[PDB]
Amino acid sequence: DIQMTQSPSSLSASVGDRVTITCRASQSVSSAVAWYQQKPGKAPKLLIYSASSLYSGVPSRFSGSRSGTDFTLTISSLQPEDFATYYCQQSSYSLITFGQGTKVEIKRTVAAPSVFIFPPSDEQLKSGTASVVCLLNNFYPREAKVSWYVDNALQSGNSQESVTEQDSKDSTYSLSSTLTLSKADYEKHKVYACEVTQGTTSVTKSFNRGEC
Amino acid sequence: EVQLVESGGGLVQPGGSLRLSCAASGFNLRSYYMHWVRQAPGKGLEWVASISPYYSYTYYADSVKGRFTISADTSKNTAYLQMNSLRAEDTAVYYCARHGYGAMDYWGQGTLVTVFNQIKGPSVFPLAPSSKSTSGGTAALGCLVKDYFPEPVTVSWNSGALTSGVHTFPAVLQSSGLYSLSSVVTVPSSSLGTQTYICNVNHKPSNTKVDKKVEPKSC
Numbered sequence: 001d002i003q004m005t006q007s008p009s010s011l012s013a014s015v016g017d018r019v020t021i022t023c024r025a026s027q028s029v030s031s032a033v034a035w036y037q038q039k040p041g042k043a044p045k046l047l048i049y050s051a052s053s054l055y056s057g058v059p060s061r062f063s064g065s066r067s068g069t070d071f072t073l074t075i076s077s078l079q080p081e082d083f084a085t086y087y088c089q090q091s092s093y094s095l096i097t098f099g100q101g102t103k104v105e106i107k108r109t110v111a112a113p114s115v116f117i118f119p120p121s122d123e124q125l126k127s128g129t130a131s132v133v134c135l136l137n138n139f140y141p142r143e144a145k146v147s148w149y150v151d152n153a154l155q156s157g158n159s160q161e162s163v164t165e166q167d168s169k170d171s172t173y174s175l176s177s178t179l180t181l182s183k184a185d186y187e188k189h190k191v192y193a194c195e196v197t198q199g200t201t202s203v204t205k206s207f208n209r210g211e212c
Numbered sequence: 213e214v215q216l217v218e219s220g221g222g223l224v225q226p227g228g229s230l231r232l233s234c235a236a237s238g239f240n241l242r243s244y245y246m247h248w249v250r251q252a253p254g255k256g257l258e259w260v261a262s263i264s265p266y267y268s269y270t271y272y273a274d275s276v277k278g279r280f281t282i283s284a285d286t287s288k289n290t291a292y293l294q295m296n297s298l299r300a301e302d303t304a305v306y307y308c309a310r311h312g313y314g315a316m317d318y319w320g321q322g323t324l325v326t327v328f329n330q331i332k333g334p335s336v337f338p339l340a341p342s343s344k345s346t347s348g349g350t351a352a353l354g355c356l357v358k359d360y361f362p363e364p365v366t367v368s369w370n371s372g373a374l375t376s377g378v379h380t381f382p383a384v385l386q387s388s389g390l391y392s393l394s395s396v397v398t399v400p401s402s403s404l405g406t407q408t409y410i411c412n413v414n415h416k417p418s419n420t421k422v423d424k425k426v427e428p429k430s431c
């Protein structure tokens with residue numbers, strides 16, 4: 001049926017910037033399109049209805065338009081209270097569909113992470129599994145390549161990452177990468193290394209199994 | 213002032229049932245369309261159901277047709293979502309919302325529905341501070357919270373006395389079907405070994421709390 005394809009999935013902007021978010025309908029649809037803003041832990045708030053009508057109380061820097069089957073939400077001059085996730089809605093008779101959302105994040109200057117590696121605990125090892133954790137603390141931008149090496153062999157398919165939302169005070173991210181091995185595989189190798197790459201710099205933190 | 217207050221969410225197994233309530237005030241819902249919209253954790257908005265005024269026509273997303281029933285009791289100024297034959301894909305925060313302008317102008321605060329097929333409390337392991345920690349600088353330490361189900365766990369440090377520099381990561385659903393996360397904190401290296409650091413991990417679904425003192429690994 002009807003699909004609203006929202007783009008981009010996220011973007012970084014500065015206060016004062018002009019921000020454009022687009023939802024493309026999969027077919028011909030009515031202009032019964034609304035835009036919402038949503039902040040973490042909170043319910044959505046209606047911004048625009050009927051593709052282009054400003055909802056009361058919503059400041060005038062928000063506007064909506066339509067071209068063909070393209071619906072667009074514009075913030076003319078981004079303000080600090082505007083960093084949030086935005087959703088479009090389309091209503092056709094009873095069927096209601098939403099776009100998948102656009103997260104609007106803040107730009108700041110580049111910041112290299114502090115990098116830490118953590119061997120598995122002896123207590124976990126006796127369970128038969130080894131988790132090796134690499135921490136990237138308070139960095140910008142989010143994009144980073146984190147590679148695992150075990151006795152200088154690049155690992156694939158045995159690690160997963162988690163990333164925090166932008167910090168409220170310094171606008172940075174933090175990231176964990178966890179390599180998961182069986183105890184038998186962990187005790188077969190000696191050197192464990194996490195390599196963090198951003199742009200022109202790579203930082204590798206390592207340990208040798210057994211050495212303290 | 214228009215207010216919508218949801219209740220009724222909680223933990224339930226597949227095939228089970230739950231009834232959500234949406235208590236309206238500041239207006240009479242007999243004159244408005246009302247909607248239920250849900251949001252799976254970390255994901256977007258998804259329409260669930262709608263009910264029309266006066267005729268009480270009901271409309272449903274294909275995926276809930278025949279299992280969910282939307283209704284309203286105008287004498288209690290309250291809308292309901294009766295949820296039967298629940299499945300894992302139904303896990304979400306459920307919002308009730310009032311219709312306006314082909315959109316939804318007032319929303320409740322949401323109520324959380326967690327469909328769970330297992331209950332398992334976490335194992336907690338130390339992320340011990342590096343012996344290579346920069347003296348006069350900063351060290352990182354933490355707790356690895358592994359193999360629990362369902363969400364959520366909460367983590368504090370020193371029973372809430374330590375908050376600056378803490379990062380508790382979003383949980384990851386592992387290939388095992390269980391969650392894990394880490395909580396970390398940066399502290400002065402000079403504090404290691406003479407300041408106690410304890411992570412407090414609470415998993416209310418299993419009525420389990422773990423407190424783990426994280427020390428430098430002895431050599």
Ligand SMILES: [Cl-]
Nearest residue numbers: 154155156157
């Ligand atoms: Cl591999």
Ligand SMILES: [Cl-]
Nearest residue numbers: 268269270271
């Ligand atoms: Cl009907």
Ligand SMILES: [Cl-]
Nearest residue numbers: 373374375376
């Ligand atoms: Cl603190």
Ligand SMILES: [N+]
Nearest residue numbers: 187188189190
């Ligand atoms: N080894």
Ligand code: NA
Nearest residue numbers: 009101102103
């Ligand atoms: Na998004």
Ligand code: NA
Nearest residue numbers: 251252305322
């Ligand atoms: Na939600």
Ligand code: NA
Nearest residue numbers: 119338339340
């Ligand atoms: Na450790």
Ligand code: NA
Nearest residue numbers: 364365382383
């Ligand atoms: Na969590």
Ligand code: NA
Nearest residue numbers: 405406407408
């Ligand atoms: Na101590």
